[PDB]
Amino acid sequence: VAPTALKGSSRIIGINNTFESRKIMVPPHRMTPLRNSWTKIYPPLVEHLKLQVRMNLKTKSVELRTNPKFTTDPGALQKGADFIKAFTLGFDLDDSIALLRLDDLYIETFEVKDVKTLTGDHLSRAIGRIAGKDGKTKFAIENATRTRIVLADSKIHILGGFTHIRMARESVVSLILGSPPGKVYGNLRTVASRLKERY
Amino acid sequence: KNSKIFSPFRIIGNVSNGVPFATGTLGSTFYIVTCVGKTFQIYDANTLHLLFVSEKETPSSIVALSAHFHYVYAAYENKVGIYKRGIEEHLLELETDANVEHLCIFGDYLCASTDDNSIFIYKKSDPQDKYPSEFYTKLTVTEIQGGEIVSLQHLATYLNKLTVVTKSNVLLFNVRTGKLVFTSNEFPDQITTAEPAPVLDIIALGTVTGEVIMFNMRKGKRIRTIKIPQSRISSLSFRTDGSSHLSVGTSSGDLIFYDLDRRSRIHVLKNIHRESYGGVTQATFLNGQPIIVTSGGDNSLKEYVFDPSLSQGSGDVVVQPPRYLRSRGGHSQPPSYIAFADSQSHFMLSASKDRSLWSFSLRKDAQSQEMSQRLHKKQDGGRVGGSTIKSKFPEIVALAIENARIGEWENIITAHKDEKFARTWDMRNKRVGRWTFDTTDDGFVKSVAMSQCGNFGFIGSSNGSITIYNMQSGILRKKYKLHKRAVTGISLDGMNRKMVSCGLDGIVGFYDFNKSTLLGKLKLDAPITAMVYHRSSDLFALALDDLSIVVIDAVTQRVVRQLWGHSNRITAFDFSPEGRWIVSASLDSTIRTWDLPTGGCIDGIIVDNVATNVKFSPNGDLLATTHVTGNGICIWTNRAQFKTVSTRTIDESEFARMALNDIDFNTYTSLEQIDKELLTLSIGPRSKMNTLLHLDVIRKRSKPKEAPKKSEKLPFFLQLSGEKVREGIAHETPEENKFKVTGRLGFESHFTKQLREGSQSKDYSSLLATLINFSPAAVDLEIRSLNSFEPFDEIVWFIDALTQGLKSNKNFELYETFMSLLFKAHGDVIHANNKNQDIASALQNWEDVHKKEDRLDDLVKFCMGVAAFVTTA
Amino acid sequence: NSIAIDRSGYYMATTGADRSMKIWDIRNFKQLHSVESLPTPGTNVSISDTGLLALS
Amino acid sequence: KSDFKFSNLLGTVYRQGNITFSDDGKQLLSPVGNRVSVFDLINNKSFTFEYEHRKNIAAIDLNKQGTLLISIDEDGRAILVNFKARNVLHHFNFKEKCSAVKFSPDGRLFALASGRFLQIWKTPDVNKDRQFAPFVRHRVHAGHFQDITSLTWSQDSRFILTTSKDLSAKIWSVDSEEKNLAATTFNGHRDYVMGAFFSHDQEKIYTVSKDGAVFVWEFTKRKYSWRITKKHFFYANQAKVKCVTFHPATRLLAVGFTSGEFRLYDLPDFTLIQQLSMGQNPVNTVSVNQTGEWLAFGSSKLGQLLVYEWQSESYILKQQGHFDSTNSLAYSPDGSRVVTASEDGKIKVWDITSGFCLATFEEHTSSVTAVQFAKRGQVMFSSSLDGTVRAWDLIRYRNFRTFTGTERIQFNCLAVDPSGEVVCAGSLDNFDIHVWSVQTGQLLDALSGHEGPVSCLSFSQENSVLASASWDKTIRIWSIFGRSQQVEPIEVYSDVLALSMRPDGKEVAVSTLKGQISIFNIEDAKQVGNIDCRKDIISGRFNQDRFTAKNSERSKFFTTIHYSFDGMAIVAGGNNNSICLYDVPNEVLLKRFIVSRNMALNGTLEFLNSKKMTEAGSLDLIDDAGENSDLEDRIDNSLPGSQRGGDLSTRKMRPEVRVTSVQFSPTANAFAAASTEGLLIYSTNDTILFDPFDLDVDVTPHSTVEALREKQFLNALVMAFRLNEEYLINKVYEAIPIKEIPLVASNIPAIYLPRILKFIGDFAIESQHIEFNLIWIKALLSASGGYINEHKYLFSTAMRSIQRFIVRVAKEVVNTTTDNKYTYRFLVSTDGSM
Ligand SMILES: [Mg+2]
């Protein structure tokens, strides 16, 4: 150290992730990404969080344990479980590594039916309005609210800071209910500016 | 005794009080430590600039001073204090009541002699310790051994020996073992001074009957004997510049120099210091330079230099006499009058009983200068009649100054005791003026005043006649004759229209200077003694003979205030610059500050010595006083200038024994709301309403004209990845279930929780309270964020919240501003569902309150109906 | 900061802001001495006719 | 009446030095030449301290508690001031070129970079009373071999990093015991070191050199010691690093280059967040708010002050000031705003309270010489030496018309008719007064009759006659309006330079070259008064002069004058170091003010120091530009004979203290004087003076409170005025119940009516009791409207303030209430569907 040196809440929401042990089940579509991305997933977990990492091929789940003799941070197990789940939900690894690095990032989860009981084409057109052609509308929302959104069919996941994901939530719901696009893009301009301001 | 408005700051104009000064050398330069009563000042030998002063006044007067490199030792009563850079570092307290008299420091030993012929020795606890602190031993010289101790001196190359010099003889004490190694032979005449010579083993001894003895300690024998018949030696010093000279001071004030090699007198400097005040108290050669410093009890320090010999050969014989080089000085007796020369606190005029007027500078000591009394040549050509022997003018009883015409002609008038005319002075030239003003009624001068414009000087005679002269020519213009007794005060207002006079008859007359008419006449109960006129406020205070200060308003000619409490004469008094206080001194040894608005004494002081004069600075920062004792001026700082002062009347009885808060601090804070039904805006900046309404366009302007070009590879969450505080809405955390559009419980925002709780409690006062606290960007973000989807519960609640606020009649602009922003961001949603009962009912209630707040329109329209008409036609 | 050359044109003395003096042999370009640490940087150098090296 | 005091300095927002944010982040401290200005950004208020240095400020610093502010001028003289009380505690001379001063984050110590020594001192307690020697030395450090460019405190108040021109950064320990912790020297920079900083964990030290290199120092094995692990480089082509700041919490590095662009870097990743260009001039200083989100930038050359919200890419504050350039000023009719004209050709409107330029116009090619407002207040006119007179509309900021003479004549003075239908301008080359019709723009007529150049013009607000004065030693009164044109010349002893018209329109004052203010009666064309002014005027000896100030005849006359709106006072200014305020009826000097006390300006001193000469001459006349290290400082663009009208570089001579114009505030008892340093606004607002009116023994602060408790309001209010104390007036004002206001108002004695109207005006602008005030004003005007009408020029300033209050804040509020009322009715009444 330099001579000048100074002298279990789950971040993810909408789903219950929770010597202790934590198991995370990986769906089939994330196995191959997990395999090729496995090389970069265990080091931050084993090294920084000092957790024991196993994943069961038989049950296709990721198993984490707190090591009494090595682990030091009591929240490390839950942070580590949160980090794996983000990679499980569909977020890119670099975004998922943000959860480990920062202490104020939450994942908000909700379903289209929770907003409105839509079926058939109506549900399909609702997913379209969130995505937009070439993902422009989702692209607009993530930059403005400064979040990362994974639109897995009718399952929506929003990653970012608290107020950030509150506003990213409001844009998405207004798209589902069928608000005219002008509010969504037009108001997205204002929320982008107002958030970054000091006053 | 401790004022709540004023605190001592320093003494000005005091350079030495007669205690022998001490010389200390830092490298090449030399510094001189001088005593001023209860404090000491350090002067630089090169320029005689003031460097440092002791932080605090010692409890008792300083007796002896010795300096050694950075550290300076000052001895008062039984305590010896060590000072570095004027900061006390350590205090050596002796264990006996006997007062210390002499002080010697050689190496790591410190020697202090008490008046009971007891010598205390202190030593350094450690070899590299800076100053001696520990108590080593105690040596006492009995009457059998020798008489009283004259001084303690240490000769070079004497290992742990102290040369104690007594009236009877000289003794040699070995401090380490505390044994008397040697006692000198008895000397017939009482010894008064000792000095170690640059030669070895030889110490110069000054007797009471004009003998100087080069006594050789090693040989125990006399070497030489000077005779100075009919004299008393007070100081001695050798010249170390390579020429064998000796400077002998005498109590008569004469300094003599001898050439020891030639056995002859170089010169004598006569009356360098007054004989009355102790003459040459100290006179020391600087180590290895041709310059000799001298001091005396007359509050002066001088320096003399020996120039090189004019003869190319035999320079030793042809010795130039010493030449005055530089000096610093002050009054020899207490100042009689003071006055501020300038609007700023730079310069001070002081006149003393020593018949000299001085200009003292508060900002720097060097700038202080004496007013020369050399007279200008008469215009007529006649010879000016005066004694050929030059004698200073008599002391100055009264004085007046103006700066309207500084530099153009004379601007100061001074009156003298038992003198039938007033003399003029010029500040810019620092020299007496060319005009003399005569009373013209065979009467002495008792009052002097000047107009603000600097053109007229008023002189008040003891026989009741007021004369007016013109300053630029000194030609009499007018003469007023109302009083039949002595006039003791004159003043002219700022406008040079109304003039006021007061005399021992107790009468105050009001004259109109322009028309020369008597406006009115006022009689008081008792004789009047002095007057001060405050030009800004047109109030002037009279020190009546019944121990009362009477304030009178010149415009109306009536007594407005009368102050009582003084136990004796009022020697002097002054107004505060703002016109709100009067500080008066009296012979009961007190200074009382009177609050004119409330007419009571707010502060009181008890000074040890009566205060002859008190004068505020025109700025108001400083207050200066002069006292019956002490050659300097006491300067005080007006603590009121940095914080408020309570105006509660002082306790008279408690003061004698020593010898509604918003009224009390002369402030008032506006109520939040005068009355419930009265409209009121928010307690804050008025730009907040405008900023909220036009937030977007204001922001649009602010943006840079060209985009900032940024790196492609940038962290997405940089704002959040901030090592740690920002308080923005973006930096908010949830506080601890079915998904809800507004917020999932445990994940909702603070504002939403307040709204829902308010909706249940039917009281949104908490939500309205926090609404006002938000920043404008926060407010726009939240009103945006309201749920706009059926059943429209959030929007309906929000309208209820604002509607309740409008009933409060407080902050009604912000509520209006909020309800505008509600329409901006949710105008469409309200419009589509205007038939919905929940929205319509809330809107109707808001309108019902809002319809009431239309009286404000009527009032505003009426005033412009009349203000435009009244201002125009 | 400074350079000096003797009369013979055989030696050179250079001082730098790195608090170092270096004597050079300019006939063959070989460094002879390097007083690497000086108390403070040397502003000037000079060489006399007799060969005295002067430093300031 | 005549109790004016310096309040604030407009026209200049930054001159040189280092800008520092307040700890709370709501106030900005900017050195303006010889004084310090404080801007409260959030509340929209500002003020400039009354203390004055003797040279331009070189460094300032405010401790975190917000209680003590130290400002050090270029000579090293330091002045310690209590921020809360706005008074001077002490003055100190450090006897060197002090480069930077910084308070330790604990608040106990402050460090000085003076020459090659770092000096650490002990702060004096604010609560303690003043002493002879408040500062106590802690230590002096002497390790560097050249000047110290800048220093930085460690966050725990235990280490100071110093960066010198030695190509070296060095670290010290404030505690003697902890010296072994930090006694290292950092080397390896090719150029000067502009700044050295600590990381938040304080394990990494960043050093920046002028050439644009950033070194990251880490304590690591090659057994442990400091090393450069990473080096980042600024690839600016020729720009040099001028000012560097680091915010450890947010890892923000703001670097300002000499080319006038600045970069925000995220250390240690060296990711470029943003860079902008604020101009072609160097960025002299940069600062960071405590929270790390406002960045304040300063460029000395054009006097620009920029505050950048790098988060949102928004400008909180962007301002540019004038030095030596303000040629004129003109208050808005209501006193809201002040306009200024500069040789740059730019007309700027400044808001008095905030102190910021709210708009700028750049049409005029050459120097704008004077500006005047129409009586209405919407329209504005300005005349320039480019040969045009231009009309501006403030509602839409459009130059809705432009006038120009046929002969291409430069204009120096202008006047505008009260009806706003005729505009007249004068010239120093044509000897005639041109006239134009505002509506049409045609040259209505050229008025002739002057045998010398026209120096000033003015219309009579009532009679509508035109008074024109010339160097012809004459003044002419033109009755332009009416069927017959008439001219009535009145002769004068000497050249006439300025002119002021009585608001009644019955008399005119004229300042002559002899140093006289002569007042004439228009209808009778005979003199009514005279005031001598030569003796009052203070003029200094310039350094280049070869003759004394006393014998000098350079400026013993007043080049500008103006009446007080009450009509009883004249404020005068000239090419001199004094602003004099005379009283007309008694022809006496009410007070004299010193414009400046700076020795950077040429004309400040009457007597100059003898030491400055040698056999060559004055030391200060010696040009030492070549000593400046940078090329741009050495380069001289000066033209040999220029006197005015060009940049500071052109003239080659020191600016001269001079007051071009002066005016009284229409709505407040204050006056503004344009000078070289800027618009010095002197105001009487403070009112700590006790100026009672018609007291008796029975009146007392206690008695009035008793009169209130006993519900004798009319007496209580009246006794309040006789004492004439604001806090006492304010209390009695607010305690009168609403039912009793109309009764009290009808019974206020007429003599006190002006005082209450003034008080309501000053209180109402910033007070919160709007409906309470409007109830009072409704009462007063209804009761005593007839009296106010009969004596207009006594109540004019008071009446304008009330109209200002009711048109700015009362009307703005009702305008926002009424529009909601219609926005409400539209939403409910109409039908919304589909
Ligand atoms: Mg006719």
> How many CB atoms neighbour CB B62 within 10 A?
21
Whether the CB-CB separation of B161 and B175 falls below 8 Å is answered with: yes
Examine the domain organization and report whether A76 and A110 are in the same domain: no
Examine the domain organization and report whether A96 and A106 are in the same domain: no
Q: Is residue A36 part of a domain?
A: yes
Whether the CB-CB separation of B119 and B103 falls below 8 Å is answered with: no
**How far is D505 from D508, CA to CA, in rounded Å?**
8
Whether the CB-CB separation of B322 and B294 falls below 8 Å is answered with: no
**How far is B499 from B508, CA to CA, in rounded Å?**
10
Which strands sit side by side in the sheet containing B581-586, from one edge to the other?
Answer: B572-575, B581-586, B590-595, B600-606
Whether the CB-CB separation of B356 and B399 falls below 8 Å is answered with: no
Two structure tokens written together for B497? 């229209």
Strands (E), B451-588: 456-461, 465-470, 476-481, 487-492, 498-503, 507-512, 517-523, 528-534, 539-544, 549-553, 558-563, 572-575, 581-586
How many residues does this entry show for chain C?
56
Single out the residue of B530, B550, B546 nearest to residue B486, CA to CA. B530
Nearest to A162 among B734, B776, B777 (CB): B734
Asked, as a colleague might, if the bond just before D268 is cis with ω within 30 of 0, I would say: yes
Helix H or strand E encompassing D580? strand D578-583
**How far is D475 from D461, CA to CA, in rounded Å?**
18
**How far is D366 from D363, CA to CA, in rounded Å?**
9
Which strands sit side by side in the sheet containing D117-122, from one edge to the other?
Answer: D98-103, D109-114, D117-122, D136-141
Q: What is the residue range of A121's domain?
A: 102-198
Single out the residue of B560, B536, A128, B355 nearest to residue D697, CA to CA. B560
Examine the domain organization and report whether A31 and A76 are in the same domain: yes
Helix-, strand-, coil-residue percentages of chain D, each rounded to 5: 15, 40, 45
Q: Distance between terminal CA atoms of chain D?
A: 69
Q: Quick check: A3 contacting D, CB < 8 Å?
A: yes
Question: Cβ contacts of residue D333 below 8 Å, gap of 6+?
Answer: D373, D375, D376, D377, D666, D800
DSSP B846-858: HHHHHHHTTHHHH
Whether the CB-CB separation of D28 and D41 falls below 8 Å is answered with: yes
Whether the CB-CB separation of D10 and D338 falls below 8 Å is answered with: yes
How many residues does this entry show for chain B?
873
Q: DSSP class of residue B770?
A: H
Residue of B nearest to A98 (CA): B717
List, in sequence order, every residue forming a beta bridge with A144; answer none if it has no partner.
none
Two structure tokens written together for D337? 């705003």
Whether the CB-CB separation of B293 and B303 falls below 8 Å is answered with: yes
Q: Which of A101, A120, A154 is the last residue of a domain?
A: A101
Is the CB of B670 less than 8 angstroms away from the CB of D730?
A: yes
Q: Quick check: D42 contacting A, CB < 8 Å?
A: yes
Q: Is residue A145 part of a domain?
A: yes
List, in sequence order, every residue forming a beta bridge with D435; answer none if it has no partner.
D424, D445
DSSP B610-651: -EEEEEE-TTSSEEEEEESS-SSEEEEEEGGGTS----PPP-
Q: Is residue A90 part of a domain?
A: yes
> How many CB atoms neighbour CB D240 within 10 A?
18
Q: Is residue A172 part of a domain?
A: yes
Single out the residue of D93, D90, D149 nearest to residue D118, CA to CA. D149
Examine the domain organization and report whether A62 and A120 are in the same domain: no
Examine the domain organization and report whether A36 and A97 are in the same domain: yes
Two structure tokens written together for B624? 């200066």
Strands (E), D213-367: 213-221, 224-233, 241-247, 252-257, 261-266, 271-277, 285-288, 295-299, 304-309, 314-320, 326-331, 337-342, 347-351, 357-361
Whether the CB-CB separation of D804 and D336 falls below 8 Å is answered with: yes
Strands (E), B197-345: 202-207, 211-216, 221-227, 233-238, 245-250, 255-259, 264-269, 280-285, 291-296, 300-305, 323-329, 335-340
Q: Distance between terminal CA atoms of chain B?
A: 64
Q: Which amino acid is at B405?
A: R
Residue of C nearest to D146 (CA): C41
Q: Is residue A3 part of a domain?
A: no
How many residues does this entry show for chain A?
199
List, in sequence order, every residue forming a beta bridge with B563; answer none if it has no partner.
B549
Two structure tokens written together for B759? 């909706």
Whether the CB-CB separation of A20 and A49 falls below 8 Å is answered with: no
Examine the domain organization and report whether A88 and A123 are in the same domain: no
Q: Quick check: B742 contacting A, CB < 8 Å?
A: no
> How many CB atoms neighbour CB B430 within 10 A?
13
**How far is B822 from B812, CA to CA, in rounded Å?**
15
Nearest to A198 among B699, B728, B738 (CB): B728
Question: Cβ contacts of residue B110 below 8 Å, gap of 6+?
Answer: B73, B80, B92, B103, B104, B121, B122, B123, B131, B132
Examine the domain organization and report whether A96 and A119 are in the same domain: no
Helix-, strand-, coil-residue percentages of chain B, each rounded to 5: 15, 40, 45
Which region holds residue B746: left if phi is over 0, alpha if psi is between -120 and 50, else beta? Answer: left
Q: Which of A74, A101, A128 is the last residue of a domain?
A: A101
Cα–ligand 1 centroid distance for D461 (angstroms): 25
Examine the domain organization and report whether A50 and A60 are in the same domain: yes
Is the CB of D202 less than 8 angstroms away from the CB of A196?
A: no
Q: DSSP class of residue D808?
A: I
Q: Quick check: A162 contacting B, CB < 8 Å?
A: yes
Is the CB of B719 less than 8 angstroms away from the CB of A146?
A: yes
Whether the CB-CB separation of C18 and C7 falls below 8 Å is answered with: no
Is the CB of B733 less than 8 angstroms away from the CB of A162?
A: yes
**How far is D182 from D173, CA to CA, in rounded Å?**
6
Examine the domain organization and report whether A92 and A26 are in the same domain: yes
**How far is D240 from B8, CA to CA, in rounded Å?**
53
Q: Quick check: D274 contacting A, CB < 8 Å?
A: no
Cα radius of gyration (chain C):
11
Cα–ligand 1 centroid distance for D485 (angstroms): 9
Secondary structure of residue D134 in the 3-state scheme: coil
Q: Calculate ∠ Cα B608-B613-B618, nearest 5°.
A: 125
According to the entry, how was the structure determined?
Answer: cryo-EM
> How many CB atoms neighbour CB D826 within 10 A?
12
Q: Quick check: B460 contacting A, CB < 8 Å?
A: no
Cα radius of gyration (chain B):
41
Cα–ligand 1 centroid distance for D484 (angstroms): 6
Single out the residue of D107, D96, D83, D105 nearest to residue D144, CA to CA. D96
Strands (E), B85-201: 87-93, 100-106, 109-114, 118-123, 134-140, 149-153, 161-166, 170-174, 179-183, 191-196
Examine the domain organization and report whether A115 and A97 are in the same domain: no
Nearest to A1 among D182, D203, D316 (CB): D203
Task: Tell me how many domains chain A contains.
Answer: 2
Secondary structure of residue A137 in the 3-state scheme: helix
Which region holds residue B39: left if phi is over 0, alpha if psi is between -120 and 50, else beta? Answer: beta
Whether the CB-CB separation of B63 and B101 falls below 8 Å is answered with: yes
Furthest C-alpha separation in chain C: 30
Two structure tokens written together for D733? 């004002």
Breaks (C-N over 2.5 A) in chain D follow: 222
Q: Which chain B residues contact residue D269 at CB under 8 A? A: 715
Secondary structure of residue B173 in the 3-state scheme: strand
Q: Is residue A2 part of a domain?
A: no
**How far is B710 from B467, CA to CA, in rounded Å?**
84
Distances D659 to B71, D88, D559, D580, D684 between C-alpha atoms, Å: 54, 27, 8, 11, 20
Q: Is residue A12 part of a domain?
A: no
Q: Which of A101, A118, A139 is the last residue of a domain?
A: A101
Examine the domain organization and report whether A163 and A190 are in the same domain: yes
Cα–ligand 1 centroid distance for D487 (angstroms): 14
Q: DSSP class of residue D612?
A: G
- Residues B809-835: b if buried by 16+ CB within 10 A, e if exposed: bbbbbbbbbbbbbbbebbebbbbebbe
Single out the residue of B589, B588, B505 nearest to residue B542, CA to CA. B505
Two structure tokens written together for D399? 């130059």
Work out whether strand B71-76 and strand D487-491 pair parallel, antiparallel, or are unpaired.
unpaired
Shortest distance, CA D121 to any CA of chain B (angstroms): 14
Q: Is residue A139 part of a domain?
A: yes
Q: Which chain A residues contact residue B832 at CB under 8 A? A: none
Helix H or strand E encompassing D436? strand D433-437
Q: Quick check: A148 contacting B, CB < 8 Å?
A: yes
Two structure tokens written together for B442? 């065979």
Whether the CB-CB separation of D373 and D382 falls below 8 Å is answered with: no
Whether the CB-CB separation of D279 and D299 falls below 8 Å is answered with: yes
Examine the domain organization and report whether A85 and A124 are in the same domain: no
Q: Which chain D residues contact residue A197 at CB under 8 A? A: 309, 311-312, 314
* Sole residue written with tokens 């305020």: D581
Is the CB of A161 less than 8 angstroms away from the CB of B739?
A: no
